[PDB]
Amino acid sequence: DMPVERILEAELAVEPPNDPVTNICQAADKQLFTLVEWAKRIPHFSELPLDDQVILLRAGWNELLIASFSHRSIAVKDGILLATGLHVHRNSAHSAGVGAIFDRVLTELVSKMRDMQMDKTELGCLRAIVLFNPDSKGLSNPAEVEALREKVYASLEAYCKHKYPEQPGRFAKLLLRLPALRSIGLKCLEHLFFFKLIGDTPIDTFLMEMLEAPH
């Protein structure tokens, strides 16, 4: 089974000098610890083999976490609310050389979550779908992960139909943010790889570990 009530509690459980980027990068490092806690409360994740748990988190962390701060930022006009409490406006991201990528978060994620009013169960299911990514390389058993995914998306579809019966499109629409999330995560990663390279931006230990090559 895969009950949306447990996914939601996962979410609720983990909710919290001026280069704007170094603040953005401290926040990401901080929320990598909380991501681990979140993952462990999603049903069946902790039962997977430890190496698989690692593979999924190392492939999905950025998508998982860009999904969370975006959804937090729905009530923010033209900006982002970091888990630290800091609001970062798009002007400040532009002024620091990352305005384009920041606007894509805004326009493809934050603002689309706002217009549909994506709720917390829905978020959590989206993020569970991401976590249970059966295309992740090196998984000992891709089928089982795919099966966990399939169960997440069947519980979501049913949650959506029951709760928003007047919106028969809503389910599809939620899933159809996953491609933007994918490209935004990759585009963000390429920025991070560049920051590491030039070395003018502090990157903390867990963030840094996520940027290491695989074993």
Partner: peptide, 10 residues
Amino acid sequence: HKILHRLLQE
């Protein structure tokens, strides 16, 4: 993967 393995401990 050191840090992540540690946190996955339980």
